[PDB]
Structure 1
Amino acid sequence: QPEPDMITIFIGTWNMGNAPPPKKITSWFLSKGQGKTRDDSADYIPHDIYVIGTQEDPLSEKEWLEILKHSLQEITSVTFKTVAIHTLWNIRIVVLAKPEHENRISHICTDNVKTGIANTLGNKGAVGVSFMFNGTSLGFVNSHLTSGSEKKLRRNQNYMNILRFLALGDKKLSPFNITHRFTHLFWFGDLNYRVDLPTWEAETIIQKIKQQQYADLLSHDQLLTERREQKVFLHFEEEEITFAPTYRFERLTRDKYAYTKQKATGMKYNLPSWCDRVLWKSYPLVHVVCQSYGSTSDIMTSDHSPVFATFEAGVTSQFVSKNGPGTVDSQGQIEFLRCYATLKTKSQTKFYLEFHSSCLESFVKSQEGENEEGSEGELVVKFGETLPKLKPIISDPEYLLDQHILISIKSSDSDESYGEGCIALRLEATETQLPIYTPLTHHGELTGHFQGEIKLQTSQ
């Protein structure tokens, strides 16, 4: 029974509005309703992994797991296995997988982050799950960010705190945050970004929605505008939105947006918004294709509609050779030529690189680079031909071309990372000098770039 090279992953996010779900929620898991929906012909075909994020979830873990498993069994006739469940207050993540994957899934981690301070600490934050699926690392974040149209900068701060403090994946990857630890990272939730249009335009927005004319609304979506200005979710993807705003509905129908200020809203307007979102970030040149992104029409217990997204995701096998794991394969090597880092820092410390990859027995430290003053005031750290030759554990090109090298540029003075990036080994050629490039980020913000050339030697 061969190992898969692709799986499908269902991501769901639903702010349940502290109400129990209705008796049938199968439309969510089938990707049916509005937007990019799943073909009817696929309805019986189970996804490999279902990741359910809820916010304002009033249920116990046991109660929700029973509903989820019985929903999936009804759809697929498969009894899904529980990989992980983690709850912070009323923010929950459930990961379910087909039973055939039980011996493919390992290194399961869970964590949460509480955002805010005093007044603003106690109900917002994020839960996350990570695990290995054979050779592939997968991370999942469900966040409930700060509410309110006039709090986009707080949401961006919440994002920055979650990606800095959520402790998932391989703890040896000490320079790297969750945005570099996984082959595929999915980040979803009630992100709470709003359509930034005047209050007076509420009924205009509603009439645009009823015409299915979303363009003038999406052009004011705070998440899209903050992402375009590189304020949040740098280097993440989101499928095009083709479904109506998922908030704020009158409960028990979907015919009515409830936007007006009420004592119950703290006298705030809740103009129709795409609060409920799914984004992803995958290592360079790994297959990931969004196959659905939409909202249900028939689940009306909450003032939010559920959102679904499904993905094809490339996965690799747990590779064994005669040599690695547990030794190197002399027939393999990774060389870096004419490499330099460009950093936004004012600092004048010397810098060194660390190279981290599961194709190495352990991470590799470089010698210090040569600082030059770049023309336009930047710091250029030149490594030229000084970088260590990396010795992968397996030389087979079917393995090595699927791997990735994480790079951290660290201060010699403090050993603190000034920038992290990732280089794919999925090269156009072996034994050939080829350009490489990654942006560098630190705690999610752009700090520079790393570029040069690479020369990969495989057994072939």
Structure 2
Amino acid sequence: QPEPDMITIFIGTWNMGNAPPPKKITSWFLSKGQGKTRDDSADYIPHDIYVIGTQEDPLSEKEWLEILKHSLQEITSVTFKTVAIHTLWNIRIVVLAKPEHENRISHICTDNVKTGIANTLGNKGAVGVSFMFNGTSLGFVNSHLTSGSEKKLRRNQNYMNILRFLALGDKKLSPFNITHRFTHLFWFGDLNYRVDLPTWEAETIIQKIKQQQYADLLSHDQLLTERREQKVFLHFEEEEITFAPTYRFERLTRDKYAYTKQKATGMKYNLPSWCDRVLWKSYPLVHVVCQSYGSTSDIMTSDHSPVFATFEAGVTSQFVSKNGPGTVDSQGQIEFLRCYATLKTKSQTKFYLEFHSSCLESFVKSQEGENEEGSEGELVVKFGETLPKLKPIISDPEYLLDQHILISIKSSDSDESYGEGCIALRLEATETQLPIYTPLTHHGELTGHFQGEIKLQTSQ
């Protein structure tokens, strides 16, 4: 029974509007409706992993699990195993996997973050799940961010609090937030970003949706514009949106957008918007292909339509050699030449690097770099040829070229990370000096760059 080198992952997000679902929701799991939809010829082919994010979910965990499992069983004739379920208030995440994956899945973690203070603490935040699938780390975040067209900045703040404080993945990766802990990170939910057009244009927007002409609406989508200006979701991907706005519908039809201000909305307009989104971030040069991104047309219990996305994701096997794990493989080494960090910091402390990777027995601390002044004001931390020689646990190129090195640049004075990034070992050549590069972030904001050259020795 060979170990897979690819799996498919289903991501669903649905704001249920506090209403029970209808008797049939199979169209969601089948990626049928509007947008980038899944071919009919695939309908009986189960995805390997289904990750379901709900918001405003009125069901017990038990009630929702029964509906999900019975749905998937009707589609696939497979009884899925529950990997994890975690609920914060009415925000929920369920992970289901094919039974053949039960002994490939380990290190299951769940967590939640509550966003806001006093007034704004009590219903918004995020839930998450992480686990290992053989040699590949997978993270999943379902967030319900702040509502309202005039609160995009609050949403961006909610995003930063979630990525700082959601405690998933390998706790030994202490300098790294969730945006660096996983081979593949999926972040989805009711992100609540709106189409920022004047209220007086509501009927014009509706007209445009009826014509399936989304271009002039997407150009005002706050998530796209905030992402363009690097205000949120830096270094994440999203598939092109080719489905109608998923909010705000009249219930029991999809024929009408309910946008006008009402006591029930706090006298706020809800212009048709793409509130319900799926984004991802994978390590550099790992296979990840979005194969569907759309909304259902036939599930109408909520004022939101369900959104689906599916992905092909590269995975690796749990590698064992005669040597590692449990020792080094002297035939393997990673060297760094001519490396330097460029930091935006106004501070003058010494800096050192930490190299973290599952290809190492434990993380490696460098010597302090040499600070110089850049031409345009910047701090440049020079490591020259001073960086240590990293000793991987396994030298087989079929293993080592699939690995990644996480880098943190830390203050000597405070031992606090000023920036985090990631370098792929999927090189064009071994035993050859080759350029490397990663942006550096801290709390998911750009703080600098790390660049230099790498020389990788494998057993071949």
Which bracket does the TM-score occupy, shorter chain normalised?
over 0.9
Deviations 1:203-227 (A, max 9, x none): 0000000000000000000000000
Cα distance in 1 for residues equivalent to 2:434 and 2:108: 36
Deviation at 1:141, TM superposition (A): 0.0
Deviation at 1:74, TM superposition (A): 0.2
Aligned to 2:299: 299
Deviation at 1:452, TM superposition (A): 0.1
The DSSP-based 3-state class of the residue aligned with 2:179 is helix
Deviation at 1:190, TM superposition (A): 0.1
Deviation at 1:62, TM superposition (A): 0.1
Deviation at 1:332, TM superposition (A): 0.1
Deviations 1:24-75 (A, max 9, x none): 0000000000000000000000000000000000000000000000000000
Aligned to 2:379: 379
Cα distance in 1 for residues equivalent to 2:87 and 2:454: 44
Aligned to 2:27: 27
Deviation at 1:371, TM superposition (A): 0.1
The DSSP-based 3-state class of the residue aligned with 2:158 is helix
Deviations 1:66-107 (A, max 9, x none): 000000000000000000000000000000000000000000
Cα distance in 1 for residues equivalent to 2:268 and 2:443: 32
Deviation at 1:166, TM superposition (A): 0.2
Deviations 1:126-150 (A, max 9, x none): 0000000000000000000000000
The DSSP-based 3-state class of the residue aligned with 1:269 is coil
Aligned to 2:195: 195
The DSSP-based 3-state class of the residue aligned with 1:164 is helix
Q: TM-score, normalised by structure 2?
A: 1.00
Cα distance in 1 for residues equivalent to 2:215 and 2:186: 25
Deviation at 1:189, TM superposition (A): 0.1
The DSSP-based 3-state class of the residue aligned with 1:95 is strand
The DSSP-based 3-state class of the residue aligned with 2:376 is coil
Deviation at 1:365, TM superposition (A): 0.1
Deviation at 1:14, TM superposition (A): 0.1
Cα distance in 2 for residues equivalent to 1:187 and 1:305: 18
Cα distance in 1 for residues equivalent to 2:332 and 2:400: 8
1:42-441 alignment runs, 5 A limit: 42-441=42-441
Deviation at 1:23, TM superposition (A): 0.2
Cα distance in 1 for residues equivalent to 2:4 and 2:26: 26
Cα distance in 1 for residues equivalent to 2:342 and 2:67: 51
The DSSP-based 3-state class of the residue aligned with 2:223 is helix
Cα distance in 1 for residues equivalent to 2:125 and 2:402: 34
Deviation at 1:346, TM superposition (A): 0.4
Cα distance in 2 for residues equivalent to 1:171 and 1:90: 27
Deviations 1:271-313 (A, max 9, x none): 0000000000000000000000000000000000000000000
Deviations 1:157-211 (A, max 9, x none): 0000000000000000000000000000000000000000000000000000000
After the TM superposition, list the runs of 4 or more consecutive aligned residues in structure 1 that deviate by more than 3 angstroms. Answer: none
The DSSP-based 3-state class of the residue aligned with 1:4 is coil
Deviation at 1:11, TM superposition (A): 0.1
Cα distance in 1 for residues equivalent to 2:278 and 2:134: 24
Deviation at 1:433, TM superposition (A): 0.1
Cα distance in 2 for residues equivalent to 1:378 and 1:244: 45
Deviation at 1:230, TM superposition (A): 0.1
Cα distance in 1 for residues equivalent to 2:264 and 2:291: 38
Deviation at 1:244, TM superposition (A): 0.1
The DSSP-based 3-state class of the residue aligned with 2:438 is strand
Deviation at 1:370, TM superposition (A): 0.3
Deviations 1:96-127 (A, max 9, x none): 00000000000000000000000000000000
Alignment length, in residue pairs?
460
Deviation at 1:402, TM superposition (A): 0.1
Deviations 1:222-245 (A, max 9, x none): 000000000000000000000000
The DSSP-based 3-state class of the residue aligned with 2:273 is coil
Deviation at 1:263, TM superposition (A): 0.4
Deviation at 1:344, TM superposition (A): 0.3
Cα distance in 1 for residues equivalent to 2:259 and 2:456: 57
Unaligned runs of 5+ in 1: none
Deviations 1:239-273 (A, max 9, x none): 00000000000000000000000000000000000
Deviation at 1:333, TM superposition (A): 0.2
Cα distance in 2 for residues equivalent to 1:108 and 1:415: 29
Deviation at 1:319, TM superposition (A): 0.1
The DSSP-based 3-state class of the residue aligned with 1:9 is strand
Unaligned runs of 5+ in 2: none
The DSSP-based 3-state class of the residue aligned with 1:73 is helix
The DSSP-based 3-state class of the residue aligned with 1:399 is helix
The DSSP-based 3-state class of the residue aligned with 1:178 is coil
Cα distance in 2 for residues equivalent to 1:245 and 1:384: 52
Cα distance in 2 for residues equivalent to 1:227 and 1:46: 33
Cα distance in 1 for residues equivalent to 2:333 and 2:22: 57
Deviation at 1:320, TM superposition (A): 0.1
Deviations 1:346-368 (A, max 9, x none): 01000000000000000000000
The DSSP-based 3-state class of the residue aligned with 2:362 is coil
Deviation at 1:322, TM superposition (A): 0.1
